[PDB]
Structures are given as structure tokens and as C-alpha cells.
Amino acid sequence: SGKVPLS
Amino acid sequence: IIGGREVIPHSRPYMASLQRNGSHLCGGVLVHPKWVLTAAHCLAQRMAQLRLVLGLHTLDSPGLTFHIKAAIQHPRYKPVPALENNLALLQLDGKVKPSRTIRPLALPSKRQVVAAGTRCSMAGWGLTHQGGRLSRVLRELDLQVLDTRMCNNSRFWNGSLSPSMVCLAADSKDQAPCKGDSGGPLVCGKGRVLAGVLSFSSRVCTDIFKPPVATAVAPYVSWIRKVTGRS
């Protein structure tokens, strides 16, 4: 769903 | 890092900035004279335009720069939406001679457990506000390990965190790592021992229902050893 890398 | 503090310059000499065209992309930790450990998702890039810069405090300075010879993503890295095994090893095109501003951080024993309640910190040059800009100076935030089961609660991370994942909370609601901080090291306890590499959160970095998470280093220690060529 909503994992957002600290990219 | 949102709500963090400027580090005493060069007090974290194991810190790397991974950079695309001279612009900061992700943190990393030097774990061997020839290797930086970082997050796998950080390498979804044209390798030709990437550099690792060691010995920094201000992003706006030379520091010591390395080309990358190889980028070894964990063999079972699974991208978003899974984001499983989110670690990559980068081989420097040179060898670090340890000084006062640049030195590797020791790996933990493979038997290290990051128990809930463990006091840690992390450092980075990541955003200092939602939708803002990179920090100009290296920063740090204190973090405590939360209970994974509670972090997997439906209103939190929804059963989605594995046992190799370390769930984190700052002391206050408005402090969190943010874009730019992943790949950076989570160090824990009195001995400031390597324990994690930061991975992900939500799109809003201070979202209290979606706390920051790092990959635990201990379960990966033997692969790191194989890849960097020790045992």
C-alpha cells in the first residue's frame, strides 16, 4: 500500500 | 531529518553521502575500507552519475569522493510495494585510509537483537521539513525501538513489517528522518554499535501512524562478510 522509501 | 540537531562536525566518520550529479541522494555507512552499506532502493539510478562522498559535514564541501565499481543489492531485494531486504553494498573505487574524519563502523555480531526499548540514533542530510529541502549540514535524531507487533497494528504498518525490520519512534511527534536519510545507519546503545540501515516510512515523514523503519543489520552480517571479502 503505502511504503515510501526515505529515497 | 525533521527536528534534528547538527552533529559535532566529523563525530560520525563512518557517514557516506550517495550523490547523483553532485546532489545528495541517500546516506550510507562505511563498513569496510572499500565498501559502503546503504539502502537498495537508492540504486534505482544511472550508476555512471553516482558518487560516494566521505568525511563530510556540510554538503557544500569537497569531502573525499569515490566512484563506485559495483553495487551489490541483497539477492532477495524486493522493491516497493514489498520493500523486502532493502540493502545494497557499494564498492568504492579506492581504499579508505582511516583518519579522524573517515573510518569504518564495525558490524555487530550476527547474534545481535534490537529489542524494543533500545535507545538509538541516526544521522543524515535528509529533508528538514515536509516537501522542503535537504539539510545543509549533517544532522542527528535520537530514536527508540518500538515493539514490532504494535508497529504492525492495523492503524500502523498493517501486519506488513517482517522480523528483519526495526520500528522507530522519536521522542516527539514532529521529529522524523525524511527524504535523503535512507541508507543512513541506525546506531544503538552506549557503544553506539551498528544496528540498522534506514529504509522507509510514509509519504508524510512525521505521520505518527506510519513510523520510520530500518532494516536490521545483524541478520545480514554473514552476506555483508561474504560480499566485502572477510569472514
DSSP-derived secondary structure for B178-215: -TT-TT-EEEETTTTEEEEEEEEE-SSTT-TTS--EEE
Q: Pick from B126, B180, B202: which is nearest to A4 by CB?
A: B202
Experimental method of this PDB entry: X-ray
Q: CB B22: neighbour CB atoms within 10 A?
A: 10
The verdict on a CB contact (< 8 Å) between B39 and A6 is yes
Q: Which of residues 1-7 of A touch B (CB under 8 A)?
A: 1-7
Give yes or no for a contact between B65 and B96, defined as CB atoms under 8 angstroms apart. Answer: no
Residues contacting B88, CB < 8 A, separation 6+: B37, B38, B39, B40, B42, B43, B71, B72, B73, B74, B77
Chain A to chain B Cβ contacts (< 8 Å): 49
Q: In this structure, what C-alpha cell is assigned to residue B80?
A: 516497493
Residue type at position B173: K
Structural domains of chain B ordered from first start: 1-12+105-218 (2.40.10.10), 13-104+219-231 (2.40.10.10)
Laid out side by side, the sheet with B88-92 consists of B64-66, B50-54, B15-20, B23-32, B35-38, B88-92, B68-73
Contacts of B181 in chain A (CB under 8 A): 6
Chain A residues touching B20 at Cβ < 8 A? none
Nearest to residue B219, comparing CAs of B200, B187, B186, B196? Answer: B196
CB pair distance less than 8 Å for B182 and A3: no
Which ranges of B116-186 does DSSP label H, i.e. alpha helix?
148-151
Closest CA in chain A for residue B209: A2
The 10 Å Cβ neighbour count of residue A3 is 21
Which of B126, B200, B205 has its CB closest to that of A3? B200
Q: B50 to chain A: which residues are within 8 Å by CB?
A: none
What is the stated resolution of the deposited model, in angstroms?
Answer: 2.3
For residue B28, the cross-strand partners are B16
Residue contact B80–A5, C-beta within 8 A? yes
Neighbours of B221 (CB within 10 A): 18
